[PDB]
């Protein structure tokens, strides 16, 4: 069946339903649930190996961070600069700034702004106070500038477990940790990443809807050279079935993560991420790993994600070869019309 996130979990000590159906937004497509399992369960091990998602409930991956909140973070995080995205709507579509050059009819809806942790917390309190509508999303890699207590927290993460995950899966190296702190209601729309991700939930509840790589045809990513490379063009709240007809065949896997849970988001899987409505602020930390190196003699049949890799390369190379990304489309069309379609 398509229950989706399933029946909401009961919090220990009878503290009530963690959340309820009405904090979820409404969408056109059906979904089946990502399995929640224990890291000891061999089924979870089997899933990570086959590059399918799984929610792990007992890793303790970021145990020391479960105590983080705004106040504790203000007090310890340091005086470094924190990237903070802004938006006039719940949807935070992201831009790659290095690509804004080559698409001029691209004024952004969501601006970046550097600031200090305290400033972010002020802007948030200011907004919350006045009862404004505007939304913010802090997203910042963890680097040297951070307080000693945070460095201690960080050191208390379950390295033993994750490093064994990296080693068993052949993955490359931890490339970064990203800290995400967001306001209730905020959405990160569907996109895919090229790295393996352990997505570690800390404060609050997020609804995570994933689509496998094989559903490329239904999600209609932006062109590789467009600033929104790797994002879906389809507006989940108002989908345009004339432009994106196969969006009507899309089927997601969904789940709700809370404090202590870790979502394996396999490489190239689409993910759409929402912080529950009226559920407070949310906090998450990612663990991004370069995926395993591509093997020597490619075995057929190919995996979907490899076909996705191929399409990407074709677009990149055609962009250089022609000396201008804007010409990629007309040439692709010229190549198929009346020939392959």
Ligand X SMILES: O=C(O)CCC(=O)C(=O)O
Count the Cβ atoms, other than its own, within 10 Å of residue 60.
16
Stretch that binds Fe ion, among 100-108, 147-155, 173-181, 187-195 (CB under 5 A): 187-195
Site for a second copy in 269-308 (CB under 8 A): 298, 300, 302, 307
Q: Tell me which of 52, 113, 119, 193 binds Fe ion, using CB under 5 A.
A: 193
Structure-block tokens of residue 53: 């998602």
The two tokens of residue 255 are 């789940």
Does 231 participate in binding ligand X (rule CB under 6 A)? no
- The distance of Cα 244 from the centroid of its chain, to the nearest Å, equals 22
Determine contact, residues 230/221, Cβ cutoff 8 Å: yes
Residue 206 marked as a ligand binder:
yes
The interface mask with ligand X, positions 266-305, x = CB under 6 A, is -----x-x----------x-x-------------------
Q: C-beta of 331: minimal distance to ligand X in Å?
A: 26
Nearest to 71 by CA among 121, 119, 123, 120: 121
Closest to 261 in 3D by CA, of 65, 17, 26, 15? 65
Does the protein bind ligand X through residue 229 (CB under 6 A)?
A: no
Residue 321 near which of Fe ion, ligand X, a second copy, none (CB within 5-8 Å, type-dependent) = a second copy
Taking CA atoms, 315 is separated from 162, 213, 309, 329, in Å, by 35, 18, 10, 9
Binding ligand X (rule: CB under 6 A), the pick from 41, 45, 81, 193 is 193
Instruction: Compute the 3-state secondary structure of the chain and give helix, strand, coil in percent, each to the nearest 5.
Output: 30, 25, 45
Q: Shortest approach of ligand X to residue 86 CB, angstroms?
A: 15
3-state SS assignment for residue 138: strand
Alpha-carbon gap, residue 132 to 142, rounded angstroms: 30
Nearer to ligand X, 198 or 216 (CB): 198
Stretch that binds ligand X, among 109-117, 193-201, 251-259, 307-315 (CB under 6 A): 193-201
Contact between 195 and 297 under an 8 Å Cβ cutoff? The reply is no
Instruction: Give the count of alpha carbons within 13 A of 253, CB side only.
Output: 19
Instruction: Check residue 154 for interaction with a second copy (CB under 8 A).
Output: no
Q: Which of a second copy, Fe ion, ligand X, none interacts with 284 (beta carbon under 5 to 8 A by kind)?
A: ligand X
Residues in binding contact with ligand X, number by CB under 6 A: 9
| Interaction between residue 229 and Fe ion (CB under 5 A) | no
Question: Can residue 228 be called a binding residue for ligand X (CB under 6 A)?
Answer: no
Maximal C-alpha separation, the chain: 66
The reply, when asked if residue 231 is annotated as ligand binding, is yes
Is 194 part of any known ligand binding site?
yes
Q: Which residues, numbered 80-99, are part of the site for ligand X (CB under 6 A)?
A: none
User: Is position 237 an interface residue for Fe ion (rule: CB under 5 A)?
Assistant: no
Q: Is 16 left (phi over 0), alpha (psi -120 to 50) or beta?
A: left
| 333 belongs to the binding site for a second copy (CB under 8 A) | yes
Q: Is 194 in the site for Fe ion (CB under 5 A)?
A: no
Stretch that binds Fe ion, among 68-76, 95-103, 188-196, 252-260 (CB under 5 A): 188-196
| Residue 295 to residue 101: CA distance in whole angstroms | 35
Structure tokens at 186: 């905020």
Q: Is 175 annotated as a binding residue?
A: yes
Binding residues vs ligand X (CB under 6 A): 180, 188, 193, 197, 199, 271, 273, 284, 286
Annotated binding site for substrate: 144, 173-175, 193-195, 230-231, 292, 313
Binding residues vs Fe ion (CB under 5 A): 193
């Amino acid at each position: 069946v398509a229950s989706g996130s399933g029946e909401p979990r009961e919090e220990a000590g009878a503290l009530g339903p963690a959340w309820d159906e009405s904090q979820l937004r409404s969408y056109s497509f059906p979904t089946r649930p990502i399995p929640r399992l224990s890291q000891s369960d061999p089924r979870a091990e089997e899933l990570i190996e086959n590059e399918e998602p799984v929610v792990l409930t007992d890793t303790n991956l970021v145990y020391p961070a479960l105590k983080w909140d705004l106040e504790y973070l203000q007090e310890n995080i340091g005086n470094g600069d924190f990237s903070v995205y802004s938006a006039s709507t719940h949807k935070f579509l992201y831009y790659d700034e290095k690509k804004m050059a080559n698409f001029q009819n691209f004024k952004p809806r969501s601006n970046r702004e550097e600031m200090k942790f305290h400033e972010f917390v002020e802007k948030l309190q200011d907004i919350q106070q006045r009862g404004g509508e505007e939304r913010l999303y802090l997203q910042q890699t963890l680097n040297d500038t951070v307080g000693r207590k945070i460095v201690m927290d960080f050191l208390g993460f379950n390295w033993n477990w994750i490093n064994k995950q990296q080693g068993k899966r052949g993955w490359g190296q931890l490339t970064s940790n990203l800290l995400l702190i967001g306001m209730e209601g905020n959405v990160t729309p569907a996109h895919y990443d090229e790295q393996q991700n352990f997505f570690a939930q800390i404060k609050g509840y997020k609804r995570c809807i994933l689509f496998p790589p094989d559903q490329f045809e239904c999600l209609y990513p932006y062109p590789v050279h467009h600033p929104c490379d790797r994002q879906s063009q389809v507006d989940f709240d108002n989908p345009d079935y004339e432009r994106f007809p196969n969006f009507q065949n899309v089927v997601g896997y969904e789940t709700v993560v809370g404090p202590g849970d870790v979502l394996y988001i396999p490489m190239y899987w689409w993910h759409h991420i929402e912080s529950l409505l009226n559920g407070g602020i949310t906090i998450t930390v990612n663990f991004w790993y370069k995926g395993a190196p591509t093997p020597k003699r490619i075995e057929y049949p190919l995996k979907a994600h490899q076909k996705v890799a191929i399409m990407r390369n074709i677009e990149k190379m055609l962009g250089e070869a022609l000396g201008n990304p804007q010409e990629v489309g007309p040439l692709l069309n010229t190549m198929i019309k009346g020939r392959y379609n």
